[PDB]
């Protein structure tokens, strides 16, 4: 089942591409029908508005012109708002290294001068704690005289 | 189940620190490509031997942190001396003591 | 040196007998007899008590 | 290559450095490089040999160069850089002991596995000129110092 | 497929981002791993089994396209085996000797290494790293709700 | 301590010298061991409360001191006297004003061998064991002098 | 198995529909520009010439409508990414202040800390001096006795 | 023309805030080896008394 999934999947695909081809022809033969009726009707008429006509194909062009410096002027503009999101993304990441250091840093230098403090404390525990025994057997050795 | 979420866990961690390290590689593979032509430039390394020259022009930043690197200095060796001063007086106690 | 727990590991000089023992055999072998006291002690001892 | 304005690629003290470089760098201070202004400023600063085929990259851009065609050439080049700052944390990302240093051998398996590759024969011609240690030790440190302000 | 598109556009970068055959491919040893950075929690039996029950040696081999990595993905992502944080902590306080929430570490790695699908080590230390205290205990509540929110 | 920095500690590599040191200068073969150890030790291994190691203690008891001065008719002395006398190079000889096995008298046997063992090897590998656990050569001379 | 076979299945019968329509749209096309491009070649140069001028006129604008599209949607990626970016600049500063918090929170835990070990030592010290004096007791009892 | 220049002024300027660095640095490390110094004086006299 899993594997028909993945069939039908990739039917799919090829079945929307080429609905998009037919798609694609459907539009440039129903554009070819009304350029065929100019052909034939009327029209492919001349001097009456030609230098009108140059006119607005040459404001198309400009138009063009002006999108392609704009584009121009937004491909630069993206470009420099991607390294600026780069530049943050790799400067957060350092920070965020960074701060751990100061973390470990903060660690290293106070534990290890307060467990420098324990540790001579525990040494002196030490010392309690074969006074504990001292006392166990002292008590004891009396208890055992006092018989 | 819980091995699953650890290793689950696990997996997606390794997964983030790649994909972040691969930005930075793109950062730095890009510039050193960048480089790597650039480098070899006479304008370039004509600029970058005048540039010592040229960073005369400087601002003034560096002698407000060298202030407050004297404070923190002044305020710790004053600190270190105080402590210092009380802990050699009260050797000289343990002197008497002895 | 802040060690939470420990493991000891005892290896005496084992039970000796030559053709001539001294006072270190006497130490020796009074180690073993402790050390055998101690497992005489542990098991069957400790344990009733 | 784009046609945006200038500006964007550079930070204003960026192109303040630019205006400052050219200024000492146009000679007779007509507001243009001239090949002689050129030669004279290399055998200023430089030795006493000068190298008229110099002039073969002056023409390059187009003819007297005015401080905006100075900062495009320059710029053009050097666009697709970044900091110096940001390169060092880049770095940091694989110095994970933050030691100062990658292995020359881990630095070249770094270039050249991932991302958009380095070729092997790219890697070595870094290590031709960057600094190295015969220990196996890239000091990176240095490398970004070397990639700004230096190239000797 | 019974799937959001929107996420399936996300999973073919975060499959391609795993790209060291140098094209379209990963293998079956990788797949477990993507379906864990994709955000799912496999058990290795469900990854063996999605796999088909390949090979020890046939996993370091064999490769999946995209395509066939989809519907593995979907499969894992309708039904599982996965249980709850409600679940987890209460397996966790089998070990929890005194009621206080909380457990050793060495316990909770050993566990971990010992039972089940074992991990390594090198795994199990990086969990309980950053869990210390000063009695070597992990609050295991907490630990479980942040391994499981992670 | 095994951890994602996975090496080959230190205070391992060291832990497992101690022995080899301690059987140099306190082992000898009698006629009972041609290992024996003519000493106790109680070794204590330290553990974390994650219950990884951070310290060992060795202690030693009753070492059979009387056996550097006289032995019976098929034994040797410590086995560092041997390791010494066969292992010394030349210069160490002349520094060490070390002789032949038959010039000491506290050799009572003289030359004795334990079979598949060499003392020339042995002593190279107890040098070693001293450089690993850090005792510096002015150390490991000093020991080889008082020797 | 079967149910996903079956879309399958159907999705390969919708895909050579759309291939045979497209295949026939392609041949249909095709004569229909030959048929076209005749009555263009038979037509007066000068209104062939003016045919050319509507056909690139309709081509040029619609590449002014693709053109302002580009730059719409590269209007719209340019605002998402500079959201992304401001989304970063405010989560770094977020993550500077929780940091500084869990610094000063270490900072005040060290404090907190050694306090309260040196105040318990201090306990512990006269803990350990009380043991002293009555393991002193315990002994002087016993000797008070053995006399 | 070099009363004048202000650049002398900011290179006087680094260089007094240098030399009080200077000396505030040399204070702080002669404190620290006076303390360390003298704290293992008064352990000792600890340790003798
Ligand atoms: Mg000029």
Redesign the interface.
Known sequence: AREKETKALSLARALEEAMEQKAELERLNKQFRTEMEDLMSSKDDVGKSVHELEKSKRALEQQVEEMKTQLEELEDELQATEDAKLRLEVNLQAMKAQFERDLQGRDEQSEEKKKQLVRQVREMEAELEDERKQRSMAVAARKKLEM | GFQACCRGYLARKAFAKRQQQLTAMKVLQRNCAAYLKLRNWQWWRLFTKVKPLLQVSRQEEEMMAKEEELVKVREKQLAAENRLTEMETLQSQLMAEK | ?????????????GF?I???N?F?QL??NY?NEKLQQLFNHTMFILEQE | RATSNVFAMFDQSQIQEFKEAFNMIDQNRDGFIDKEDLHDMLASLGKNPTDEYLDAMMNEAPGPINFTMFLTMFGEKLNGTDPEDVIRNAFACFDEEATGTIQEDYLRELLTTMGDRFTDEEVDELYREAPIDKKGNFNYIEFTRILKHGAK | CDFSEEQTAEFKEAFQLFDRTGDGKILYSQCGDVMRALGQNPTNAEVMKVLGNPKSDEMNLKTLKFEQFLPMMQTIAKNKDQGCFEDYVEGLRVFDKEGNGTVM??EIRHVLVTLGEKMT??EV??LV?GH?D???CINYEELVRMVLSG | S???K?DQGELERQLLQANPILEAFGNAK???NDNS???????????????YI??ANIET??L?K?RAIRQ?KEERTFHIFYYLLSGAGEHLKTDLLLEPYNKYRFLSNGHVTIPGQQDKDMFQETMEAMRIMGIPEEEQMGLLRVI
């Open positions: 040196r802040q060690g939470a727990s420990f493991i000891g590991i005892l290896d005496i000089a000796e030559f053709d001539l001294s270190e130490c020796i180690t | 570490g060495a080590e090198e230390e990086q790293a210390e000063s009695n070597g | 095994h951890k994602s996975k009698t006629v009972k150890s003519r000493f106790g030790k109680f070794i204590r291994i330290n553990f974390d409360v994650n219950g951070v310290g008891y009753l059979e009387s019976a």
